[PDB]
Symmetry: none
Subunit: 508 residues, 4 copies
Amino acid sequence: VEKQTAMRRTFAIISHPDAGKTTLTEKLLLFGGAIQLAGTIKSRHATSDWMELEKQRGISVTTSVMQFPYKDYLINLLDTPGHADFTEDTYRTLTAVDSALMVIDAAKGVEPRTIKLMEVCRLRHTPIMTFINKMDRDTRPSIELLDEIESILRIHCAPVTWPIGMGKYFKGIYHLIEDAIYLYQPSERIEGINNPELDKKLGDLASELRNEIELVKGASHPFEREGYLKGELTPIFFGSAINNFGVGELLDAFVKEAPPPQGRETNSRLVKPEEEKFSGFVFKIQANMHRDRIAFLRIASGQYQKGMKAYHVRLKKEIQINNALTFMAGKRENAEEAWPGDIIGLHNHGTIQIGDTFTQGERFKFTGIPNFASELFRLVRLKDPLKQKALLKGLTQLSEEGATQLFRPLDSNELILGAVGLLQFDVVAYRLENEYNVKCVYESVNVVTARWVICDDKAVLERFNQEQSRNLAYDGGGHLTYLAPSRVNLEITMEKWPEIQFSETREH
Amino acid sequence: VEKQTAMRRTFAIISHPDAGKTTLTEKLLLFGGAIQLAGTIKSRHATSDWMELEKQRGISVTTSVMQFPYKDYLINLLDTPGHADFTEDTYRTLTAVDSALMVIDAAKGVEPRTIKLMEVCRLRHTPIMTFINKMDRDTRPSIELLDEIESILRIHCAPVTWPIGMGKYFKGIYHLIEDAIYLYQPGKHERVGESERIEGINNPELDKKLGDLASELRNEIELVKGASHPFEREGYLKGELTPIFFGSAINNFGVGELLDAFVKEAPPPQGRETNSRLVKPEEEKFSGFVFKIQANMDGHRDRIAFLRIASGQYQKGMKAYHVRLKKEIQINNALTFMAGKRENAEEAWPGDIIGLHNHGTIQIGDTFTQGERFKFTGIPNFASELFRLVRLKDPLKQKALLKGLTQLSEEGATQLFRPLDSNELILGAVGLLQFDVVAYRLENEYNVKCVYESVNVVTARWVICDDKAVLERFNQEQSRNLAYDGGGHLTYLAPSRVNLEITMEKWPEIQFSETREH
Amino acid sequence: VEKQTAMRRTFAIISHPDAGKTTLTEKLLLFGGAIQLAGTIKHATSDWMELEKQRSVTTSVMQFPYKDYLINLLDTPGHADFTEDTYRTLTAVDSALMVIDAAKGVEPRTIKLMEVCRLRHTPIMTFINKMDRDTRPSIELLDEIESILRIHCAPVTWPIGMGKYFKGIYHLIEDAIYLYQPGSERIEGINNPELDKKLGDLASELRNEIELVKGASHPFEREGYLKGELTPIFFGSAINNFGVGELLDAFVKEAPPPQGRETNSRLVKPEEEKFSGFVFKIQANMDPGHRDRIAFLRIASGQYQKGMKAYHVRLKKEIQINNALTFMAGKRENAEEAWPGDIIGLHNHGTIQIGDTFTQGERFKFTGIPNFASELFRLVRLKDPLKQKALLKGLTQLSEEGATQLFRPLDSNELILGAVGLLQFDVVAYRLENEYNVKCVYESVNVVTARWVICDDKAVLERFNQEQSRNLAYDGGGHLTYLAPSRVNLEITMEKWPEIQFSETREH
Amino acid sequence: VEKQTAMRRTFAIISHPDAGKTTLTEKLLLFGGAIQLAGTIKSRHATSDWMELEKQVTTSVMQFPYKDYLINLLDTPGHADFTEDTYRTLTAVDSALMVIDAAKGVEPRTIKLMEVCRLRHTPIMTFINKMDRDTRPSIELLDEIESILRIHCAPVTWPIGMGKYFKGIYHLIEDAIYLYQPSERIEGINNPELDKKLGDLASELRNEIELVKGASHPFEREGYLKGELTPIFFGSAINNFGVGELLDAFVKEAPPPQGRETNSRLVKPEEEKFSGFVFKIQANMDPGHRDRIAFLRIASGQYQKGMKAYHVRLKKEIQINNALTFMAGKRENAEEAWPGDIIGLHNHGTIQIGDTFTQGERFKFTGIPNFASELFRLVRLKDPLKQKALLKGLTQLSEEGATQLFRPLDSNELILGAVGLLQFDVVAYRLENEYNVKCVYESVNVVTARWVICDDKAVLERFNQEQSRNLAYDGGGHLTYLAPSRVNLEITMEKWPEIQFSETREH
Ligand SMILES: [Ca+2]
Ligand SMILES: [Ca+2]
Ligand SMILES: [Ca+2]
Ligand SMILES: [Ca+2]
């Protein structure tokens, strides 16, 4: 039962849209023998478009988690949708990984989502490996790309591979550890950075490689396990994903260095995966676009066995998991068992919520499962006023399943919806109609961001509430929330109240 | 003369690549009856690909500036290449405009180049009109787009038009000043006059045509009225406020509204400061300044120096005074830029750009008058964003390399740095293409083959300090990271962002600038 | 019982005299801790006889431990005590270690001993000795081995410089450099910059030569080594104990454990529970009046146990083995047991002959135990024909004990002795006198070489005999033998009679 | 990979000649669909005749589909081509089907093949054949099977009448009657419809079924799989009657490919890595040729046409490019194979009986047996100069299971031991064709053989001294008693009760 966890590697790719996530995912799948999934994923929208396919077909349930073997390792790749189906779940999914793979477009460097996803990873000091993609086209200087990562993303860079040329004159990569050159020939290998054959085939590029490698080892850091595991250092790899080049070097360093499933804290103790008793937590729910839903559970300890009895901690109730969805690529049936690090899909009809902890009787709740500051806001109401209670009931449940956040402004009876991605508004409106027979209408509001408000000094907090009530609300969890009409307003308010904490995350 | 000036509008579009500048340019050209030209720019790349194309056709300089009539106005649009042909010239072109038109991809909002080009504009408080493009596709929420502009770009937003719907349900725009709705109806925006217009935001006809979009509009406009500013000419002319327009350039929608407000509100040619007096465009005597130089790639060794007319009148074949060379020259056949022209014009006016032919006697920042000696100020260098050591395979060609690099620097082709503690030569560029142009020029004009090497430099700042005791002290601790540029200005070459910060905090009495007067 | 076989390594050193066998042997004993033995190890046959009379058998076999292995090194005397026993000893090994003088290359005995090993396709490991002095070019040495010895060379270590500028060796499999610093500094990586700092130009020449070797040579592959088609090459200086360790570690790792042997019927495997073995060498006591002899037996299967009953197949009766000579270094007395691969010395007085098979009852005879073409020939007669009977009785016995070969021409009445080594004549002369009170005299004969004649076609053979009987003889075992007056005569006869097989060896 | 093993049923038919094996095989092939193959075996000598034809293989194994099942039927030649290979084959099956001639009951071959099956406690199912002719009483047949074949009988079908008045069979489990009409089904043994059609036979059925209740056993799975109990079926193979019921119970109850012990550990079929073992070798008789086929049972992993295999005994990597497959109706050899299947390994004398194959892991499967020789002949040459060749030939022949070889302690003579008379012909021919030696046979005073085992070296040495005239070592170096008579073996075994005289030994 020790080797089942030992061989496992659970992770996700963080990247700004168009960096190369999908392209890389395909290649890694090819290395895993998953020729099936590989083609399927590349065979891939407005939010509306996603909903159309979603209803009729909606086979986005079988690829939210991609499990595949490589060497003597089992790799769990969790999906982080970034386009039409970007939602808060994209952030929350990172809570269920043990490390992350960051993809950067060499021509772009660090982008807005790169920063956001890193901030999320930063919540658990999640180890990061970096693939600098698209070397086959012109790029920013490699040193510049690295420097920016260190300054903006606040993490030391440690090159493991390095580009030879760029764009039209991209001739391959140099593995700093192997001291070998892999030639890019749309894979001849050459040992020794000083090997005279390099100068013969690559010319001036050969001495440029030597030049750059020297600059690197003077202004940069060498790879280091400890720093990497503490999230203070990231090994960098350069390649061209579309040409499946540099990927193999990345994957080998990944399985070798990336962490196996780690333990997680609870409201009582540290749970380690090697414990014989089963346990896990729910971090994502998606409903059938029917009334059944699938709650994605990361196993935290013990083992899962089909048809087993488990303890639903919140509901103080024993349950039986009869046919939990598993994610082995190419499988025909659900696996009979699963292990720590793995994800399983729990079928239900509304009895499972975000953060739900499952055990075998022991009553604890896993911590660290976050809500994230909403980025998009809308007022929600009905045309038929006689349906208010069902609207609230629906929104509450939806809030509990992480589909949306819900805000009740102090000075009114209005309801405000908070979303991280545009699709959530579509999913809410549909689910409300289908599951609650409630027809809702959206309106624009003057809110652009949100912060949770925290002050242990109740006299200060009370003066704050009195003054800022127009911009205050309670969310679905009862937490005081500041809904800023503008970034500038947020700045002024925060500056006006240095005694009050304004947070971008909170525990669900 | 004063009438010639009054009808002119000289501007450039500022935007991040892919935002829609080329598309908007096409549509503006069509409004100006420049059908042929619109077609050409529309039929538009690694830096190497650009180099090839340039060598083959070499007519990227005749469209560097696009002049076209609209109503009783004459419009001068200076291009700001943002793709393969991005270079320092892209920043410096902004010194030659009287206002700017910012284009934003509504699905993207404010991007890195948007920010950078706004910084350049800020140097002169250049007035900004804003166009939010791509409404025909899903966008970020309108109110959010505006907040990011005010927050990131430090300028008040003043909606003049406003979107009705978005993406698949984008149905038109409301004009806040006209109180009128222009319906978006593909197939009716090819020729002017065929589109449907509705009077009044509370007009019942709206609810008929657009349904729930009508009440959403009414709601959003009230939010905007309460949290936004109304358009105000003074704030606009001061560069503190930007009127916002929304549309879909590819479908020629919302463009007419933008163009009409532009010609109405955008400033005509303005006075330009000098080392002494202020020069006003209405003055009788001709004068101007050179703000960029483009070399003929095709055994040619002629170049075009782009000059903005600051006052008076250019006449083909006129005598003029080259202030730097303290010499009289003749201007026999300067390039002009009227769309669809058969030949260069006989005259040009303030706000206009003309192209002066020369073989290296004209440099960036050069002032030309009719006798008066003064130099226009405010023509900037901008901090280089790319760095490379340059050297030779043959030591015997050092003199030619230096001569070439010195001329190229003086023509703005590149920046040139000489570290204090070495004899090495470092080239500084804003755009990747500059290194290609420099290498080609060195070979073709100076018969010198240069070799580039990466160097440990990511950014640079010009160093200024009143107290010379502190400064000279500073030149001791940091000489290894110091250099003199081609103008003899002390420059700090930061190996990293962190190093710059750390050096700057240690020396707060020392100013570190990202721009300097050329 | 199986473990005991797996840990054993039985081998012999094959080499031309003065190549460095004694020196390398000394160093190998040192690695095994046989300090004393290494010391003892370190003219004419007349002198060797004297030392043998005055005072060998205890060191004919050298057994010593090394790590978790037990090594049996069988001696192959090449100086004054060289005899046919030197050849026949190789039939009792499972592999061989060839030592070559880097200054000499392939020499006459190198060729003969390889020919003997080739009989059983004996696996060969090669040590190129004397790197501390000038040598023949390394590429030359290997080509001579491949061309002359008909075996592929697979470099495993490679020399750095030579003679005065000998700096050490490169291990191709470890990619590590061992510095020869005569007072064991190891440098990792052939492209490691520390190499150029310490070895200067020799580093680049090394990398050049390794490239040449890669291209025109073979990498080690054990199937080929074990088949006798490929020999791993090691370089060093035995006198300086340099490069010996690498060889030894590869030896115990790659060299085969005791293997099964064929018999006149079934194949016999070492792991079988029953004891069995064969006699490959015999040595008599040179003491006047004594009849003591030691029959060297290799154990083919089962376990030797002191005082055991064994079956003497030729004599078809049961005997007892009370105090068999054993060969552990530094031993005090003969071991109480021994296992497959080991040699033991059977005490007797003439009842044990070359080829004798011993079992625990089963009736079979091991095959492949060879006679080798004699290289020296002499007529043997008496001054006084009085004891002619005793002479013939002695020569017969000596021939059966491998001390000499005996030929009796088809057409005449002379007795002709054949020897591989000069010493044999001295031992025969001395043994006849001391054991058969016969004084023999030798006479030169016009014979330079011998070949056993084989032909299944009686008519052809009779035709052959009618023309060549003058050159034909029966040997001691009744085998037809051609005695050539000259090399040319043999070539002419062989070319005239291609239907007839002329062999340089036969089954004893 | 899991269902691959679970869908396979590998067995063999055990019976005395003339019982009905050939006929039942045909019927089984029919249910499967292999009409052609079935029609072939129907076209069915002395050893002399067989040797003739065999000069001028693919039906040694008969693989065929039935529902969700794949059936591997290993043949067990009982007539002219009966040899030791016939016994050794059974080591390659996971269960067996016993066919008995109703008029005869348990016959000599029946007993021998059951003894072989017993070596592995091989599950047995039984088919009492030829109900259409007069028979021994059914209770008598069951009784004989019990005491003689030491296995409890568990009827699943039962005959109604016999000879002239065979009217059908009764299915004790289903409680249904299938009528024999040269296939009407009736339910309830006490169904009044039986009496109407069959008459007094209806009461006789009820009577006998009740008799079976108290004196016989009910089919018990665990017991059957343990080899302690065999389900009994009745019918007439010539009329394809009662056959269907046997097949269905077979595919349902018969065990899937089981694991096999080795010198190192128990190897399971489910294992990823490919492994197998040779239990039979067939030589091409055609003159000049030197090719053989080594039949290999797959114990684990999977066979892939063109895979790399590890020849354990030779410590050598080999390549299996075109291994013979035995799917009925096949156009070419199969690209893959799974545990329980048999494939043919082409070679020229480098593969031997007992040979294990893996993918690098060096171990050797166990339980592959040698069986006591039943026929004996002295072998010699008229040309004494070929003694070496004879021995080399005979040794090789011995390792390929073509014969056993014995060397008596008190002479230099060579005795061959065979199970089937054909082996002598095959050996004489092979010695000639492959070793160019002409052997001569002479009768010997030996009728049977037992392997001598005894851990008491004190007793063993005296035994050897006293009985040396009847002792020899075989081709594996095992001490063997060669009895001049049955009575001699009985006495000898009584005078030495501390010595084990076995009829089998691991090869
Ligand atoms: Ca609930
Ligand atoms: Ca100049
Ligand atoms: Ca004798
Ligand atoms: Ca063999």
